[PDB]
Coordinates of C-alpha atoms and ligand atoms in Angstrom, one line a residue:
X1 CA 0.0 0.0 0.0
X2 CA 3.0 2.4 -0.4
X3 CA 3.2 4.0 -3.5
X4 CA 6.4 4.9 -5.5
X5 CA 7.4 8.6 -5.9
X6 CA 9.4 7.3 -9.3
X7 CA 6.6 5.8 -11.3
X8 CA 3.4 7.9 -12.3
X9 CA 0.8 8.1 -9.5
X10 CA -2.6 9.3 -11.5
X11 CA -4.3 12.1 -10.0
X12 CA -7.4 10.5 -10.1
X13 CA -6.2 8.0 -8.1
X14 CA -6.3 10.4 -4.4
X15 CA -7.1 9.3 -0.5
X16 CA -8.5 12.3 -0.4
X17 CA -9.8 15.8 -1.7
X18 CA -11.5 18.9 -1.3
X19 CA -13.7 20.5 -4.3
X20 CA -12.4 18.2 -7.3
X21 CA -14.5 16.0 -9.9
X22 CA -13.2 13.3 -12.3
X23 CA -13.9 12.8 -15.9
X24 CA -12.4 10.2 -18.7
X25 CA -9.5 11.8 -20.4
X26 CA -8.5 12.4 -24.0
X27 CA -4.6 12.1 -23.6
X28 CA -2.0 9.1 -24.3
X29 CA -3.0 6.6 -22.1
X30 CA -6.9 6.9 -21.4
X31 CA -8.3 6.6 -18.0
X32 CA -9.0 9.8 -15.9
X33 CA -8.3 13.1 -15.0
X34 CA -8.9 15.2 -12.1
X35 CA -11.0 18.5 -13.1
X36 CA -13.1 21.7 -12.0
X37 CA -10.4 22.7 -9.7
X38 CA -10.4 26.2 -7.9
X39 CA -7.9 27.7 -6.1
X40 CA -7.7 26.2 -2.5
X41 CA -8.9 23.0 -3.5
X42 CA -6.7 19.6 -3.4
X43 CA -6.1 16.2 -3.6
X44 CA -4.0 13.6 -1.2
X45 CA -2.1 10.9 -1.9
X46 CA -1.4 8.9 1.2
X47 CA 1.7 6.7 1.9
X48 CA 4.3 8.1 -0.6
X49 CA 7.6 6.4 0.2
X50 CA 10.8 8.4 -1.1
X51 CA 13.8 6.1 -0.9
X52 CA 16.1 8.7 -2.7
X53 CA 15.9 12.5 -2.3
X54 CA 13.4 14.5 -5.4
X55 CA 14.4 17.5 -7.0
X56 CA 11.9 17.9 -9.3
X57 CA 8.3 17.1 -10.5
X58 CA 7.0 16.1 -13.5
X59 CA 2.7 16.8 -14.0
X60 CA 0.5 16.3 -16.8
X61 CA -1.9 19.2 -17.4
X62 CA -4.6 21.1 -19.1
X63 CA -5.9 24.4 -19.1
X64 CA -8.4 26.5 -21.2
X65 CA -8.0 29.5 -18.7
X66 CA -5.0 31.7 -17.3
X67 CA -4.2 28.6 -15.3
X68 CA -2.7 28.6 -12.0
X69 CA 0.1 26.8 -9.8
X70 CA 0.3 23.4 -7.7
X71 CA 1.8 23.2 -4.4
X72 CA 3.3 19.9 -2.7
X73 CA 3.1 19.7 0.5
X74 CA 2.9 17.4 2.8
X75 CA 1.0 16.2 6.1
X76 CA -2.3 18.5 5.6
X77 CA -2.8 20.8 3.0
X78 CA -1.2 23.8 4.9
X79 CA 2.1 21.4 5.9
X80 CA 5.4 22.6 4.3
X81 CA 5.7 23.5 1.1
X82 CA 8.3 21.4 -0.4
X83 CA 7.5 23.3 -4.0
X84 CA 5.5 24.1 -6.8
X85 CA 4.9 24.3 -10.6
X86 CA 2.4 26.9 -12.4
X87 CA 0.3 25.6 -14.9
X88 CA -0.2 28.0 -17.9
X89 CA -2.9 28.1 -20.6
X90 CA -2.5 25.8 -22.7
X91 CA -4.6 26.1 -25.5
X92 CA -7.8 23.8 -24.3
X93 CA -9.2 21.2 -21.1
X94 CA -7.9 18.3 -23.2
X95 CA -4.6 19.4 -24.5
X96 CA -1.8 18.7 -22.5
X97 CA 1.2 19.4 -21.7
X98 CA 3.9 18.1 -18.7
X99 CA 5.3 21.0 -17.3
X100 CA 8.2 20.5 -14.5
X101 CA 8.9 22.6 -11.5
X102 CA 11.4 22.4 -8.7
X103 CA 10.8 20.4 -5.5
X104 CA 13.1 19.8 -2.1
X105 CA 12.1 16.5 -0.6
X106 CA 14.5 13.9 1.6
X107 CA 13.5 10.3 2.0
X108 CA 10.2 9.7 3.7
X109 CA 7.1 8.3 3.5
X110 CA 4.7 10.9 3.7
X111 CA 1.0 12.4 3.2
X112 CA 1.2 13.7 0.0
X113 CA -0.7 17.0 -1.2
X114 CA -1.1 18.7 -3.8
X115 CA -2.7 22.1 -3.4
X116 CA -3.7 24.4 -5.9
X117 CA -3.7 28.0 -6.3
X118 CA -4.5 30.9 -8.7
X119 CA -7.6 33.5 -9.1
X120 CA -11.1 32.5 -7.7
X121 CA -12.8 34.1 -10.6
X122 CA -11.7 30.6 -13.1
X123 CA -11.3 27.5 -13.2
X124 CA -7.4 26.5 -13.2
X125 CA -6.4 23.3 -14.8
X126 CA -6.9 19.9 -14.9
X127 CA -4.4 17.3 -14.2
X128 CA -4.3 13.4 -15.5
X129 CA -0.6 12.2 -13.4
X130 CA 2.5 13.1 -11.8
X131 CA 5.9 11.6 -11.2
X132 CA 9.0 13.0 -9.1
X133 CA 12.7 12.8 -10.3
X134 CA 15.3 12.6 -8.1
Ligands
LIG201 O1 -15.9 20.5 -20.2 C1 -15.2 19.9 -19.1 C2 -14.3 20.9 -18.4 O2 -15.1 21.9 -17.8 C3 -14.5 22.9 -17.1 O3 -15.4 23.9 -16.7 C4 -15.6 24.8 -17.7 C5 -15.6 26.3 -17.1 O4 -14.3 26.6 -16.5 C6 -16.0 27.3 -18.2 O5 -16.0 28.6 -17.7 C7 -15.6 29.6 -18.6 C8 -14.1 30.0 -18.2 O6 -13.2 29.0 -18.5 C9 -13.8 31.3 -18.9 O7 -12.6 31.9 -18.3 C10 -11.9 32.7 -19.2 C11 -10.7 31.8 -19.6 O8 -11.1 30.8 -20.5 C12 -9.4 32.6 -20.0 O9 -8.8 31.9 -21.1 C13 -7.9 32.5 -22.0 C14 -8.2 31.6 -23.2 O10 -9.6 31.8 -23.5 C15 -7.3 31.7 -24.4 O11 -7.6 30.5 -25.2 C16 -7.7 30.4 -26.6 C17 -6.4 29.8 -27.2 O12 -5.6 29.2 -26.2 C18 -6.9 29.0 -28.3 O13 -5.9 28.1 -28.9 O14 -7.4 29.8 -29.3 C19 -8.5 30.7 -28.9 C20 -8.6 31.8 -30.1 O15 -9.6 31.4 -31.2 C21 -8.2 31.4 -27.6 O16 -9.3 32.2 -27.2 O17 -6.0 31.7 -23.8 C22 -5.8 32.8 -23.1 C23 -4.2 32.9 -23.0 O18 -3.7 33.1 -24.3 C24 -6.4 32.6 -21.7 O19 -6.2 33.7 -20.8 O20 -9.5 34.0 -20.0 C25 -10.4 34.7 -19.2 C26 -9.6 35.8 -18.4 O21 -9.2 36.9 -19.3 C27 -11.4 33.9 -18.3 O22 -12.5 34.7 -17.8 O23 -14.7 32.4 -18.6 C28 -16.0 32.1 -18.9 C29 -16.8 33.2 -18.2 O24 -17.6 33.6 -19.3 C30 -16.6 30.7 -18.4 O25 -17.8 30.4 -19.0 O26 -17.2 26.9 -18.7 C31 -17.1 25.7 -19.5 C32 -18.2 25.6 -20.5 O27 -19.4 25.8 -19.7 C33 -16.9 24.6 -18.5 O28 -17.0 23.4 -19.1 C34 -13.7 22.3 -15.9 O29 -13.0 23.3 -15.3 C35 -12.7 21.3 -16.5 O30 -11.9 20.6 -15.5 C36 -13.4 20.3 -17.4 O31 -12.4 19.6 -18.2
NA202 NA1 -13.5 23.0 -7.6
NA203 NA1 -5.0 9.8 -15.2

């Protein structure tokens, strides 16, 4: 029940989440994507075990709007902030990109969150996976 930091975890795939829906995506690979997400919402993935330290992180994203960013952190959705990535326009809900943003985060298993941010007056992206590099 540990997941692995290394391989994609879908972001449909969450323990937990505040103000997100799922639909079927369009991108390479099918399945889901997370969607209609509004700054302060997120989604938790519990039980993420790091066994080498992350620098960065990889995530698969859409947006028809301005767009917005993602945070990590960890332990509750206001627990450190171990990074982010902003998430621009894109050109469309089902066109998608992987943008990459800088993270610090040491071995661990931990509570992870990502939180997202941006202007209350849009919606900000969606997201389909994400995948850390050390
Ligand atoms: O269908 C499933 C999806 O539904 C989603 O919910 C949406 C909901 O958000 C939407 O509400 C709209 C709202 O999105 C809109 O906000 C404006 C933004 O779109 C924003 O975007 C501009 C963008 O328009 C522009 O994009 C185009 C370009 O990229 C393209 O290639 O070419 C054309 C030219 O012909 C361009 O126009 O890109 C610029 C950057 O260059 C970007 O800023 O701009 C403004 C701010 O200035 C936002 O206000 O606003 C509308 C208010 O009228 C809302 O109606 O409604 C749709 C349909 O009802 C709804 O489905 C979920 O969020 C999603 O997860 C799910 O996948
Ligand atoms: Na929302
Ligand atoms: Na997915």
């Amino acid at each position: 029940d540990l997941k692995n930091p290394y391989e994609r975890i879908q972001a449909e795939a969450y323990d937990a989440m505040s103000g997100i829906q799922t639909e079927g995506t369009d991108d390479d690979g099918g399945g889901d994507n997370i969607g209609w997400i509004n700054d302060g919402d997120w989604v938790k993935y519990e039980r993420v075990h790091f066994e080498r330290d992350a620098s960065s992180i990889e995530v698969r994203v859409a947006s028809d709007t301005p767009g917005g960013r993602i945070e990590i952190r960890t332990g509750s959705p206001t627990g450190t902030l171990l990074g982010d990535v902003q998430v621009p326009n894109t050109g469309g809900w089902q066109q998608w990109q992987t943008v990459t943003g800088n993270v610090q985060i040491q071995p661990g298993t931990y509570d992870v969150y990502l939180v997202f941010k941006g202007s209350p007056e849009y919606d900000l992206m969606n997201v389909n996976w994400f995948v850390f590099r050390a």
